[PDB]
């Protein structure tokens, strides 16, 4: 779950 | 910083 | 995205992590608005947002689960990937990008709950959150321990 903030 |  | 979004109410009210809350809305006819979710995330435990429930809104669009749905924080969060608007930046939510149907709605509020305390820093959404990470850490916890007990459920 590719989970980064943008 | 970014905008929406 | 009407059958898919009840069989995630359906199975969200069979099974869901708890202290997460998940419901539709009503339409103007008095059906329930599926494509309008009333959500709420608590922060983690062991992390400076325990104790908080925060409070978001899911937006899905006809054509859902093509799309990702539209997550914001309703009131706007103080954390550096939210925009000030509440809208949550998070690369599966933008469908150019990470989106794919096969992600869930369980999916997209653990991973919100996941974003509250590794924030990424490199390309920050808003001015005011990430100014206090990026100069001052302890002034930046306080800010979220202050906000997680103003968040309280």
Redesign the interface.
Known sequence: ?6 | IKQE | ALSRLAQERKAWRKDHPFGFVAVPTKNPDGTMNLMNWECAIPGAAGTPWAGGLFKLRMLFKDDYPSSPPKCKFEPPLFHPNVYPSGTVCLSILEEDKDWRPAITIKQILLGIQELLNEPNIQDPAQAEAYTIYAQNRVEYEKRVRAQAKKFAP
């Open positions: 779950l590719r989970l980064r903030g943008c």
